Amino acid sequence: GSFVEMVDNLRGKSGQGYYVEMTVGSPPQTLNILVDTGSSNFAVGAAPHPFLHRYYQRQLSSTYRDLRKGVYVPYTQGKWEGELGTDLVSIPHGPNVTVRANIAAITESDKFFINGSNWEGILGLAYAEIARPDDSLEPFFDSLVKQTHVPNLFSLQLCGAGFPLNQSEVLASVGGSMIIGGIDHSLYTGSLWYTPIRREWYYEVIIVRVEINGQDLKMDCKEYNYDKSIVDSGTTNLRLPKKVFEAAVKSIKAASSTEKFPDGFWLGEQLVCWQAGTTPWNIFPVISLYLMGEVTNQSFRITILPQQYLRPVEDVATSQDDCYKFAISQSSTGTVMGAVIMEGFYVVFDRARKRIGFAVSACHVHDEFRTAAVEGPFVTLDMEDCGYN
Numbered sequence: 146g147s148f149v150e151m152v153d154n155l156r157g158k159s160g161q162g163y164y165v166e167m168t169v170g171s172p173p174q175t176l177n178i179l180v181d182t183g184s185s186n187f188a189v190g191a192a193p194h195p196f197l198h199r200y201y202q203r204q205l206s207s208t209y210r211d212l213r214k215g216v217y218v219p220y221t222q223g224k225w226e227g228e229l230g231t232d233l234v235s236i237p238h239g240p241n242v243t244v245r246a247n248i249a250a251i252t253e254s255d256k257f258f259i260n261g262s263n264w265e266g267i268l269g270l271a272y273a274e275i276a277r278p279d280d281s282l283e284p285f286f287d288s289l290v291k292q293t294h295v296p297n298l299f300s301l302q303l304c305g306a307g308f309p310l311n312q313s314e315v316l317a318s319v320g321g322s323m324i325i326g327g328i329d330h331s332l333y334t335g336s337l338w339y340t341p342i343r344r345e346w347y348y349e350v351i352i353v354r355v356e357i358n359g360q361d362l363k364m365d366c367k368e369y370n371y372d373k374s375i376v377d378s379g380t381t382n383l384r385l386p387k388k389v390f391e392a393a394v395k396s397i398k399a400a401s402s403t404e405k406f407p408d409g410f411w412l413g414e415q416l417v418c419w420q421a422g423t424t425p426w427n428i429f430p431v432i433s434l435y436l437m438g439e440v441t442n443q444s445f446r447i448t449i450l451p452q453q454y455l456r457p458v459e460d461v462a463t464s465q466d467d468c469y470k471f472a473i474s475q476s477s478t479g480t481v482m483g484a485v486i487m488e489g490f491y492v493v494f495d496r497a498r499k500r501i502g503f504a505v506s507a508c509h510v511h512d513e514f515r516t517a518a519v520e521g522p523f524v525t526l527d528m529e530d531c532g533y534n
């Protein structure tokens with residue numbers, strides 16, 4: 146209920162990724178670690194790199210254990226290679242515990258690290274099934290639960306700002322919260338609705354209906370989870386399977402036709418700008434994703450605003466202009482509910498009850514006329530059929 150100690154322990158409000166402070170080794174070596182529910186490897190920079198301000202020095206840790214085994218990890222975006230080992234890890238603004246975890250010491254990387262992001266590592270919070278080299282490499286959260294009395298669940302509140310933040314601002318501002326082992330009521334309003342984790346590999350879920358300003362996209366629901374649907378705090382966008390992406394874009398285009406934007410905008414490649422303060426939020430439609438409920442034949446829906454899917458970007462010419470990039474994009478590997486989705490809600494990864502809860506986030510961005518939402522229940526049927534095999 147109240148884990149005040151961990152509240153506001155995240156940073157990256159308008160950066161490239163949300164991260165938490167961690168220390169590894171003995172004496173403790175401080176590092177900022179990206180919180181990623183989309184993968185399962187705990188990895189940290191362990192050699193100098195143009196974008197790293199600091200990195201893991203194994204020679205200086207008295208508790209480091211070298212497993213003498215290499216590891217390679219390719220994500221949808223970026224990839225890295227490293228050397229496996231274990232060491233003691235702590236989270237300054239997390240529970241007061243220390244755990245020996247597997248750690249991939251990154252020695253080579255490609256398009257992984259992000260210039261100015263301020264994080265030097267990644268905490269894969271998903272299950273062993275997708276860990277590399279294979280599922281025998283115990284993920285961090287599993288190590289944590291096994292070695293301590295921290296309950297088997299964590300919750301995340303990722304806070305977008307709605308406007309660009311500069312270097313000092315990102316460092317001096319709260320990026321959100323990761324409550325390890327509990328749920329804090331101060332992070333959301335209204336009810337928490339839970340959807341089952343279909344299978345424990347990624348945090349896979351099942352979407353049963355999609356609406357653009359209340360209008361049903363009306364596609365075979367399997368199309369929505371075609372391949373799979375996952376909740377991924379390590380991915381910026383709301384990514385949709387090709388067929389779904391094209392239908393959504395066509396409907397978003399129609400809802401906002403009073404204004405015309407170049408194709409590059411819809412591809413997420415070129416930003417769109419408006420005179421300062423004149424962003425026409427109201428012409429853009431809200432987007433609702435319906436999730437299977439815990440009760441049979443029951444579903445609920447999460448609704449986001451253009452304030453979630455139009456990400457703030459500082460325009461080249463300092464211009465007082467407010468610019469944004471369209472952050473809904475195409476996927477060939479299933480739906481990815483990234484930051485575009487998570488910044489609108491307080492999300493609970495209840496691993497113990499194999500379910501994920503959603504509640505309107507106390508920090509989501511909006512305007513006076515609309516807010517993000519979580520509502521239920523809805524009587525929908527044969528949603529078991531929505532899953533892909």
Ligand SMILES: COc1cccc(CNC[C@@H](O)[C@H](Cc2ccccc2)NC(=O)c2cc(C(=O)N[C@H](C)c3ccccc3)cc(N(C)S(C)(=O)=O)c2)c1
Pocket residue numbers: 160161162163179181182183184185219220221222223256257258259267275276377378379380381382383384474483484
């Ligand atoms: C087990 O390994 C796999 C293998 C394949 C796919 C997946 C699922 N993907 C989720 C994550 O694991 C990885 C982790 C990661 C990669 C690179 C840098 C930082 C983090 N995420 C991505 O691959 C990944 C990360 C980003 C990205 O910019 N992430 C940054 C750090 C971020 C910015 C803002 C908010 C959250 C995160 C973008 C995309 N694109 C597809 S996009 C433009 O459509 O959003 C993919 C996992």
